RNA sequence: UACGGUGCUGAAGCAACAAAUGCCCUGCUUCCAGGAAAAGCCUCUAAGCAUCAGGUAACAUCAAAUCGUACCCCAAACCG
RNA sequence: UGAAGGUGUACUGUGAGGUAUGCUGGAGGUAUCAGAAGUGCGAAUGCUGACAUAAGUAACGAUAAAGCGGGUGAAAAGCCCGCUCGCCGGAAGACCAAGGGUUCCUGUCCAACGUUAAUCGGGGCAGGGUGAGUCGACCCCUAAGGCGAGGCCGAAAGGCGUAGUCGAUGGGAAACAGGUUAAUAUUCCUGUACUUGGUGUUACUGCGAAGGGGGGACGGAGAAGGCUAUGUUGGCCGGGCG
RNA sequence: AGGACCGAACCGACUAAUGUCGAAAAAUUAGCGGAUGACUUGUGGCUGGGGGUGAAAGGCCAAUCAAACCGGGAGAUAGCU
RNA sequence: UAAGGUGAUAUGAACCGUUAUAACCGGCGAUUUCCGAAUGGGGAAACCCAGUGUGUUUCGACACACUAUCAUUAACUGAAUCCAUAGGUUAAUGAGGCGAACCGGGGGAACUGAAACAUCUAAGUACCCCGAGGAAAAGAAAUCAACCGAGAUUCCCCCAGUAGCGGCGAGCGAACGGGGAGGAGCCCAGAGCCUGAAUCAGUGUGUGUGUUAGUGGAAGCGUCUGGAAAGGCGCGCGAUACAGGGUGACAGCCCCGUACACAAAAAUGCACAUGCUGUGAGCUCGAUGAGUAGGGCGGGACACGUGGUAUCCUGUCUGAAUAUGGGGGGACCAUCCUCCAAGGCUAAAUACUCCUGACUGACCGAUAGUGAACCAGUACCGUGAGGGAAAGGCGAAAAGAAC
């Protein structure tokens, strides 16, 4: 009966993507987090 | 930013001390204004965003000794 | 500085086949010789489509430990310790105990 | 024109029915090409290696098969094919 | 190899470097992937081969 | 006929009538609640330059690169 | 010439426990007296794993419905082909966007997966399959809005914003039938098209903007007229004589 | 002409039964209201936590709301079990 | 250095070598797709779209180079008004981002404690932000002491839970003085004779050398038991080497090693001779940091909560004297003692480990130890920030079971 996840990948990049991240103040902390936890996925891409 | 030019006062920060002594983080805020200082030397007018007492240190010395100073510091005025 | 290799007569000092002598077949990477007619253990060959296909029980001869092995001194007739020295310009092996060159 | 680059281009001829009924059945060859290799430079590669007349180029860039085995997956390499139909002048 | 191909001249190395791709790369590289070619070292030697003159016209 | 389909040949191929929510219609009538923008497209001249460069036709020739193209899509492939 | 661990037994101490030994195990163990502790668990709706219970019980996901024959195969209510029967038909049909991302198609394999069986499969394992000047994207244009040189403002981070530059859900060049593979087609092939560019010749010739003007360029409802997609009838055609 | 009338699509959710370890963490069946407008819907934007938004229920802000979620202060504090 | 190699899961294939242009390990080179500060413009990271100049070409075209913003900097142009300044082009030049703690500055909570709570505490802690460096900061007295004299900072131990502070509650809590670690001092607010002599900051350059490849590197057997000997058993035998690790059961002597002795063409990390673009000595006379010290008001920092409150920092309003002078000595005042602010630099002791080597554990031994002994920050969960698993061992050797 609809739900909350209706997926739409250019507002999906748009939103949580490397350069909607990389462009902020704390995007660039939130890619030097992941980067240091050491994770593949880095953002949606 | 407020921050005058000549004197480098800006805006420090401190309580706010009630009658029962509440502790309320306010800030200092210099008296700063906009003001056209004639310099007679190159004969034209300068704009600095200066406070009440730089305005005091420019009757002091001359103009053209602070703006030595602002210049050196690597400023514009 | 590979005491045992290639082309050499050596004996067995620990193993099934104590006390029993042969030339090296190939010294591998991790630190074990094959040697001929020694260790022969009964490999159950599977007959494989691609290439011959013999289709029975085969002697090889598996690999056995470097320190197990020892070259033959063929003097005094029994296992030897081997060194290096400088002959002339070039770097050679001897025995220890009957101080020759190999 | 282009001298040794042409060379890095044509990787290898494909076989396949699809390929087959090209060669007698239209006088075409397919053929995989480096990822990039643009429909002049295939055309322009064929007429100096192969050395026959070519009519065009058409041009697809195949999917990388995920493949899986005993536990880790695995992406196949892309790639790209090129159906390139050759003139009168034929023969490989 | 590369010791006799260090005395040769600018010009010259070339023609080794278009003689290389021309026949024996992509021949072999076409001859392997059709399925004539028991012989796979030569896919490797001469890849090495190339970078070697291609290394040594770099000279200035 | 591998019994799946391949190859061959192939007559007539009209009028009437009914008819959309399609199109003419980004039209016409009207009502007020008064109904994006900006390029391509046409046109006008400024700064310049005339034996040129440019513009208009007619023909010839060359080019049109790269990416997506399978399959599901009111669903057993999407969201639960 | 059998350690720890596991498992039994027979003694022994007031108790926590000790001692010796048959089986298993196949390599470590540790007297004594000291020293140090992650030092002893049945409970915390304790935490993790394994295994019980209800229990071979409920349920097997729409009340659209199956039946028989022949094939395949070890085996067929469920697969394949056949003849009936039934259900949807402004959908339970056929094409797109979004979103998935190989699920497509061929060969082979049923351990698991499928709420049963499975020769079948959107399951496993190999191989194959996505062809564009015209369709769509990219590209030229801009809306909402975003970013934003200088700039203004702000302890710092940063906020706003101009010139700009992005940003489609909108505006902007042109292709349709027909055929074909196991899987692509307005993309390949037969036929007939059109478009926008560049370069050269010939004959003419005032062209020229980041600038002006035109256009692009526009609501709601309503009404009628003219048409076609589409159907329907007759005619013509081939078959039929049940 | 109409926040006109009846009535499908579409939008909603009044009654009843069913279901309540469900087919389903809000649905099905039979009826039910609106259905040219204060309508509905796709795509893309903007508004952010004492903040937003709200034809106002303390409703809604990712199945969470009289102050979201994630991480940190942090092993908060517990005269209580 | 070297007789075997072509990394592993993992055999197979096809070839290179063998007293030495195989393989391997080093040093310095070349190569270094695309994204990413990303930097030609843009963008939904790993994509799209360009511009200007060079050489070539057979029309089709490629090829390599350069073009971000900003800051200091010169050059040339440049306005509203005459030169003008703003402003606009090019070359030179550095910055930009990332990484674990440590450190200096700018801001800065609350739970909690007080058995409630507002002063207070937690605490200038958590956190956010900026800026460094191998450390950083601090620093050569306008210091602190008691008529004795000490002589920059920094850290440690005391002094001392003392003196003080405090709803005088909770709590917080010094200094002097003494032991140590450590040591070090100078420039500018300028003139004479005289000048390269002390001093450092670079270049080449020397040995004592050490660092990234290394090489050598001692000495065991006969028996018994067992699948297998290092084990029991008997004589040995080396030790500047019995640290340690392997090998078919516990190895000083089978092998790696170990002490121990020697290593480097290059890249060097260094410390002394050291020629030297370049830098300034001895000594006269004279100067000795103003919108500052201090004050009024409001805050903060000092253990010190405005209190009788010294002292430092300041937002605001003010305002001295300037060596026949001024600050400090804990309200304040007078003689004595003390120092010279308002200008600067500065090594070491101290903090810290993302990181590359040794070496040790009365540290763990797969529910432990890192979340992670295993292809784990993976699968999986969540729009996202973010959360986050489970999963070790055949054997001595695959001899992994022909038929
Ligand atoms: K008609
Ligand atoms: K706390
Ligand atoms: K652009
Ligand atoms: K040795
Ligand atoms: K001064
Ligand atoms: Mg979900
Ligand atoms: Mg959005
Ligand atoms: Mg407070
Ligand atoms: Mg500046
Ligand atoms: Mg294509
Ligand atoms: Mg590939
Ligand atoms: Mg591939
Ligand atoms: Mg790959
Ligand atoms: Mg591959
Ligand atoms: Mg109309
Ligand atoms: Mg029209
Ligand atoms: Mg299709
Ligand atoms: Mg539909
Ligand atoms: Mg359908
Ligand atoms: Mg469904
Ligand atoms: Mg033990
Ligand atoms: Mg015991
Ligand atoms: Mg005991
Ligand atoms: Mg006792
Ligand atoms: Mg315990
Ligand atoms: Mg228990
Ligand atoms: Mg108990
Ligand atoms: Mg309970
Ligand atoms: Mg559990
Ligand atoms: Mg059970
Ligand atoms: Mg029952
Ligand atoms: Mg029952
Ligand atoms: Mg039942
Ligand atoms: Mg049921
Ligand atoms: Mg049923
Ligand atoms: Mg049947
Ligand atoms: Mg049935
Ligand atoms: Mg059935
Ligand atoms: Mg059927
Ligand atoms: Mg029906
Ligand atoms: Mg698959
Ligand atoms: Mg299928
Ligand atoms: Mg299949
Ligand atoms: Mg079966
Ligand atoms: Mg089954
Ligand atoms: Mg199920
Ligand atoms: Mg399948
Ligand atoms: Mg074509
Ligand atoms: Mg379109
Ligand atoms: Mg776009
Ligand atoms: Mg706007
Ligand atoms: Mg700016
Ligand atoms: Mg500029
Ligand atoms: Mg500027
Ligand atoms: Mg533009
Ligand atoms: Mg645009
Ligand atoms: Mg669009
Ligand atoms: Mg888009
Ligand atoms: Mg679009
Ligand atoms: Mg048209
Ligand atoms: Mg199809
Ligand atoms: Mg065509
Ligand atoms: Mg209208
Ligand atoms: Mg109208
Ligand atoms: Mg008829
Ligand atoms: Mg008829
Ligand atoms: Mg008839
Ligand atoms: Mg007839
Ligand atoms: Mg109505
Ligand atoms: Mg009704
Ligand atoms: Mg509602
Ligand atoms: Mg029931
Ligand atoms: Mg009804
Ligand atoms: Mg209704
Ligand atoms: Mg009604
Ligand atoms: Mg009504
Ligand atoms: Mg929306
Ligand atoms: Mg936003
Ligand atoms: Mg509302
Ligand atoms: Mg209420
Ligand atoms: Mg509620
Ligand atoms: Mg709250
Ligand atoms: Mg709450
Ligand atoms: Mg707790
Ligand atoms: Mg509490
Ligand atoms: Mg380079
Ligand atoms: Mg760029
Ligand atoms: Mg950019
Ligand atoms: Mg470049
Ligand atoms: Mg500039
Ligand atoms: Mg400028
Ligand atoms: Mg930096
Ligand atoms: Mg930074
Ligand atoms: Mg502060
Ligand atoms: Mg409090
Ligand atoms: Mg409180
Ligand atoms: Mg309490
Ligand atoms: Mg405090
Ligand atoms: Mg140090
Ligand atoms: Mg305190
Ligand atoms: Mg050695
Ligand atoms: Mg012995
Ligand atoms: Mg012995
Ligand atoms: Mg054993
Ligand atoms: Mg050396
Ligand atoms: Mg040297
Ligand atoms: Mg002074
Ligand atoms: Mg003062
Ligand atoms: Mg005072
Ligand atoms: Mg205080
Ligand atoms: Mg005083
Ligand atoms: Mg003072
Ligand atoms: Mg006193
Ligand atoms: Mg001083
Ligand atoms: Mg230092
Ligand atoms: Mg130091
Ligand atoms: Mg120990
Ligand atoms: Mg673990
Ligand atoms: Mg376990
Ligand atoms: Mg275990
Ligand atoms: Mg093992």
Known sequence: ?45 | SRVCQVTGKRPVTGNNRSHALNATKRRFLPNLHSHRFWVESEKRFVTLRVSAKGMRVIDKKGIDTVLAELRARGEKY | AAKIRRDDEVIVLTGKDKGKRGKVKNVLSSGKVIVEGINLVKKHQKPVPALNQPGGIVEKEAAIQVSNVAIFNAATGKADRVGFRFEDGKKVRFFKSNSETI | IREERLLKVLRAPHVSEKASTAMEKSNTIVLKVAKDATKAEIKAAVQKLFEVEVEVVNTLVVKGKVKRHGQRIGRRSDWKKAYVTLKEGQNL | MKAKELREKSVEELNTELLNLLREQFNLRMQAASGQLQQSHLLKQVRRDVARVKTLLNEK
């Open chain 1, 1 to 45: 009966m609809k739900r909350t996840f209706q997926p739409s990948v250019l507002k999906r990049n748009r939103s949580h993507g490397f350069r909607a991240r990389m462009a902020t103040k704390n995007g660039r902390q939130v890619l030097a987090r992941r980067r240091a936890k050491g994770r593949a996925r880095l953002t949606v891409s």
